[PDB]
Amino acid sequence: HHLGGAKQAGAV
Amino acid sequence: TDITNQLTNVTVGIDSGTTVYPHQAGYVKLNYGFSVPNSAVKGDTFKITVPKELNLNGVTSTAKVPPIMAVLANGVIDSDGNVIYTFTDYVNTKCDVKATLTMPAYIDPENVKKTGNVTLATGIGSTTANKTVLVDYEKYGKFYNLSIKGTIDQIDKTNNTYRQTIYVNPSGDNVIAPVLTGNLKPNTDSNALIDQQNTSIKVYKVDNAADLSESYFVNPEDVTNSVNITFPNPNQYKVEFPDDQITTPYIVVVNGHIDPNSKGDLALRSTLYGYNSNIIWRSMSWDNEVAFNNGSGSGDGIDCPVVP
């Protein structure tokens, strides 16, 4: 078992 | 009237790092400053040019541009993606008016499909700014023969929906008895509602990894009916894919809902389970999170002269 990620930005 | 060209003392700029990482909450800021002609009256306009390589919404379904506050002007995004501001009656009575504006802008997924150098340009009239940056979408996640990466789009906060695109096995490995689950990310107070009546999943077979976007823009072989989609636990979905193996990537597109009374944001975990050729069971997880940003604008004027 292993783990990565993304985060994304956007307009309020 | 359009008074774009009668704006004076115009400055434009782009604030960003040299590399932008759109899947690590990277964005850019467009900055503008200008003087407004005393002759400006209410309903006068002026147009900002926004390039195709950006959008102003990013993960969110649409955006609002900052009204410029002293309201000095109200903005809307036109059908070309450019921004039109309309002057208020504030300019009817004020003189030596001036204003500055900032808008976050985001690498547009469809116009920037791959990782590479992008030269971004914006402006107001003839005054423009440009910047060339590397857009790095980086790499899908991997653990033995288990690859996975996912991205969110179209967070619509009017309708409380979201969409999530997941590449399963983007690396083209052989997976024996592959299983995907879609979860909330623990301890985020995640606002996703993942169940039969809030969640619709489609899955597509991919012929060639090469036909996939690094940006995760997807233009939708549909194999939804050939797979078994289930809702086995609270706020969890499961996807079960003739020989109990897969040897190609799959696109999993999830059209879901969010909970507006939830105390957190959209925070998601997707997990791929599978055996390798040694028949060992493993899992690879991919978190998906979001960050929201706003622009702002302000102006100032003085009372126009009154003859004494």
Residue numbers in the entry:
A (entry chain C): 400 to 411
B (entry chain A): 230 to 299, 303 to 452, 456 to 476, 479 to 545
What does the published report state?
ClfA is the major staphylococcal fibrinogen (Fg) binding protein and is responsible for the observed clumping of S. aureus in blood plasma. Starting from the N-terminus, ClfA contains a signal sequence followed by the ligand-binding A region composed of three domains (N1, N2, and N3), the serine-aspartate repeat domain (R region), and C-terminal features required for cell wall anchoring such as the LPXTG motif, a transmembrane segment and a short cytoplasmic domain. ClfA binds to the C-terminus of the Fg γ-chain and a synthetic 17 amino acid peptide corresponding to this region was shown to bind to ClfA. A crystal structure of a Fg-binding ClfA segment (residues 221–559) which includes two of the domains (N2N3) demonstrates that each domain adopts an IgG-like fold.
The mutant ClfAD327C/K541C generated a stable, closed conformation form. Surprisingly, the closed conformation of the disulfide mutant ClfAD327C/K541C was able to bind Fg. The crystals of the ClfA-peptide complex diffracted to a 1.95 Å resolution. Two copies of the ClfA-peptide complex were found in the asymmetric part of the unit cell and are referred to as A∶C and B∶D. Although the 13 residue Fg γ5–17 chain synthetic peptide was used for crystallization, only 11 residues were identified completely in both copies of the complex. As observed in the apo-ClfA221–559 structure, the ClfA(229–545)D327C/K541C N2 and N3 domains adopt the DE-variant IgG fold. The C-terminal extension of the N3 domain makes a β-sheet complementation with strand E of the N2 domain. This conformation is locked by the engineered disulfide bond as predicted by SDS-PAGE analysis and confirmed by the crystal structure. The C-terminal residues of the ligand is docked between the N2 and N3 in ClfA and makes a parallel β-sheet complementation with strand G of the N3 domain, whereas in SdrG, the N-terminal residues of the ligand are docked between the N2 and N3 domains and form an anti-parallel β-sheet with the G strand. Tyr338 in the N2 domain and Trp523 in the N3 domain play an important role in anchoring the peptide molecule. In the ClfA model, we believe that the peptide may thread into the cavity formed in a stabilized closed configuration and therefore the ClfA-Fg binding mechanism could be called “Latch and Dock”.
